[PDB]
DNA sequence: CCAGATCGTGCGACACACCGGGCCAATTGGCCGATGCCGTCCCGCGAACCCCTCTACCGTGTTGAGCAGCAGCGGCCT
């Protein structure tokens, strides 16, 4: 857990990660899975990454 | 004006300067010689330490991209 301050701890939760066991690895993602789809509106923040 | 500080000079004392004598104190420091406790070693036995061996109802299966070489096949050529 990341405990610099209340905001950092809260933002450690509410995090969606696309890489891990069963996901896609860091070096393999193209440039289409790293884009802001127009369906992100209200489901995933386009600024905070 | 003239009298003590400074110094000259003088007499003595005198603290040693000598360089040579003639004995001594302190203080030895060696181990001398004699006595005694510890290191080393050679067993002595025993606890453990590691290796080898055998047991016979029977039981039968584990991403993308780039570049290059090989196998199968269409189709001439004889």
Automatic annotation (TrEMBL):
The RNAP catalytic core consists of 2 alpha, 1 beta, 1 beta' and 1 omega subunit. When a sigma factor is associated with the core the holoenzyme is formed, which can initiate transcription. Residues 1-49 form the RNA polymerase Rpb2 domain. Belongs to the RNA polymerase beta chain family. The chain holds residues 443 to 491 of 1178 of the full protein. It comes from the Bacteria. DNA-dependent RNA polymerase catalyzes the transcription of DNA into RNA using the four ribonucleoside triphosphates as substrates. This is DNA-directed RNA polymerase subunit beta. Transmembrane segments: none annotated.
